[PDB]
């Protein structure tokens, strides 16, 4: 199988700017390289085949170049409708047909610091035997953020899950939840539960915390 690699995975651009997307193949695929566009909730549509030929009805701002193992897709002057995920795909040696893992074009904006909030588990949930502790990071940019759970100053690992929103349709920020799950018996052994957030928009890490029984 020919592995197709697409780096960077995310590209921050503004309308009007030039976007260049990279696609690399593990072996030469000659000119047999295609590109697809996919918007959320929609099927892919073909943009480029033959590594440089525009598909039917694709506007001229889309340009494809490369051969062998090195390929690129260039949008010369980005329009708002072009914000989407882009996949490259070889058809030189198949089966199997192989795709790159996609490059997302993200809407660029100024750095925004997350607002941080921590939520203790509800009394109702503890009665059922489990404790979910929730840390919220609201309305930040860029997406990269580090969340660290500390329980009585002891760093936690392996017991939390994160979810991140899609870029907000009005302000282009992200929000993130970190959910720490503990048994009720484990939760009741400790007092101070803390969420420490590191982000570019913050000069120093911010911690929100609470005391279990109070």
């Amino acid at each position: 199988e020919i592995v197709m690699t697409q780096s960077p995975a995310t590209l921050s651009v503004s309308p009007g700017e030039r976007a260049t997307l990279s696609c690399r193949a593990s072996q030469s695929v000659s000119s047999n390289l295609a590109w697809y566009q996919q918007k959320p909730g929609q099927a892919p549509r073909l943009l480029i085949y033959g590594a440089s030929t525009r598909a039917t009805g694709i506007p001229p701002r889309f340009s494809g170049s490369g051969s062998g193992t090195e390929f690129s897709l260039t949008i010369s002057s980005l329009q708002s409708e072009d914000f989407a995920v882009y996949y490259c795909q070889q058809y030189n040696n198949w089966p199997p047909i192989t795709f790159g893992q996609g490059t997302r074009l993200e809407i660029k904006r100024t750095v925004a610091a997350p607002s941080v909030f921590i939520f203790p588990p509800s009394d109702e949930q503890l009665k059922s035997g489990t404790a979910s502790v929730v840390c919220l990071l609201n309305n930040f940019y860029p997406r990269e953020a580090k969340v660290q759970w500390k329980v009585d100053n002891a760093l936690q690992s392996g017991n939390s899950q994160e979810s991140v929103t899609e870029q907000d349709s009005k302000d282009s920020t992200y929000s993130l939840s970190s959910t720490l799950t503990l048994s009720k018996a484990d939760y009741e052994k400790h007092k101070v539960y803390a969420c420490e957030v590191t982000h570019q928009g913050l000069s120093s890490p911010v911690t929100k915390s609470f005391n279990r029984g109070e």
Partner: protein
């Protein structure tokens, strides 16, 4: 206009079987190879199977060989994917994709038309969520922004819908994408940021619907007072 209409997706038990259909119009079906391509939730595109225009040659991704069978009824403008021995990793949207090139087999491998896709979900149980408050406290300044929410936990399959105050409250609401826990059940939180001064005076209720289990919850979210 050529058209590709998938159907047959749905909930299916591990080891079970599903037959996907794709109905076809707007082009001479017989002159084109067809393919199935799939997309697991939050993931990229993965080619599954190919069948030549004649129906004689079929190819499969390694992970589905011996489990899936592609076929076509050219006289009826139908494409099929028989999926047996279903596994959790087969959960995905399945697209029928038409090859762009008709009469040059060395130029095939490019998909110029895709259907909207049909969803296959491997499932062990159908379960409605438990809903718990994310209660605001005085942790936020009484002259700044406060946050509250609802934790919607241990449900299957997707989706749930969450509104606030029966749809009156929409500004500042974030409902997070569902994350599958290690138990195989989904969990999410819906949060909203409000002015701290509205705590107490304004009531906050999240309305959670899970249609597959006929679960409807209206959960009051109230400040804790330390």
């Amino acid at each position: 206009e050529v058209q590709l209409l998938e159907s047959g997706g749905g909930l299916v038990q591990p080891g079970g079987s599903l037959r996907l259909s794709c109905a076809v119009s707007g082009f001479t079906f017989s002159k084109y190879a067809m393919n199935w391509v799939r997309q697991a939730p939050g993931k990229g595109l993965e080619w599954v199977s190919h069948i030549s225009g004649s129906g004689i040659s079929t190819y499969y991704a390694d992970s589905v060989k011996g489990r899936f069978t592609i076929s076509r009824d050219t006289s009826k403008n139908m494409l099929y994917l028989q999926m047996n021995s279903l596994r959790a990793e087969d959960t995905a949207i399945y697209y029928c994709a038409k090859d762009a090139i008709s009469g040059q087999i060395w130029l095939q491998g490019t998909f110029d038309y895709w259907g909207q896709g049909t969803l296959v979900t491997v499932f062990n149980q159908i379960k409605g969520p438990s809903v718990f408050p994310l209660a605001p406290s005085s942790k936020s300044t009484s002259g700044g922004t406060a946050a509250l929410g609802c934790l919607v936990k241990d449900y299957f399959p997707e989706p749930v819908t969450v509104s606030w105050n029966s749809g009156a409250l929409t500004s500042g609401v974030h409902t997070f994408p569902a994350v599958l826990q290690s138990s195989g059940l989904y969990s999410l939180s819906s949060v909203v940021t409000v002015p701290s001064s509205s705590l107490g005076t304004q009531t906050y209720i999240c309305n959670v619907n899970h249609k597959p289990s006929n679960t409807k919850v209206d959960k009051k979210v109230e400040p804790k007072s330390c």
